[PDB]
Ligand binder design. Sequence first.
Ligand SMILES: *[C@@H]1O[C@H](CO)[C@@H](O[C@@H]2O[C@H](CO)[C@@H](O[C@@H]3O[C@H](CO)[C@@H](O)[C@H](OC4O[C@H](CO)[C@@H](O)[C@H](O)[C@@H]4O)[C@@H]3O)[C@H](O)[C@H]2NC(C)=O)[C@H](O)[C@H]1NC(C)=O
Lengths: 53, 54
Amino acid sequence: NNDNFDKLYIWGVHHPSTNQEQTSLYVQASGRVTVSTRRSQQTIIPNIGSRPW
Amino acid sequence: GTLEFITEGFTWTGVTQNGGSNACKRGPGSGFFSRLNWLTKSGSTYPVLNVTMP
Ligand SMILES: *[C@@H]1O[C@H](CO)[C@@H](O[C@@H]2O[C@H](CO)[C@@H](O[C@@H]3O[C@H](CO)[C@@H](O)[C@H](OC4O[C@H](CO)[C@@H](O)[C@H](O)[C@@H]4O)[C@@H]3O)[C@H](O)[C@H]2NC(C)=O)[C@H](O)[C@H]1NC(C)=O
């Protein structure tokens, strides 16, 4: 951020319903997403399961 | 303002229900919390459970 203002970044992380779907899309059995700045840090590990339709 | 509990028939297939530990003894033998259900292995399987209740 070389600008003179705060930048807000919206991002997310996908939670598949089945392992089959997890592998179709991202190969690895279990994913992981880690977004970080010099002073903060944040890490989500997607959970696989059925939610309501 | 109430602990009015209503049981529903969840159907937990492929797992053994009603486990309890000697920490939580009910009467002579051993038991568990009354409104919770300790699901453990059956045979040597724990299926991926997937129930729903509208
Ligand atoms: C974990 O349990 C989940 C919870 O029920 C389960 O998902 C259910 O699966 C059925 C699959 O068809 C879906 O039901 C939908 O219901 C709405 C209500 O009106 C319908 O609009 C729609 O109807 C159709 O589906 C028919 C056949 O499957 C088809 O013939 C019709 O043409 C029409 O397309 C939906 O079916 C939901 O996916 C879902 N219900 C709920 C409440 O979540 C899920 O399978 C299970 N997970 C695993 C891994 O087995």
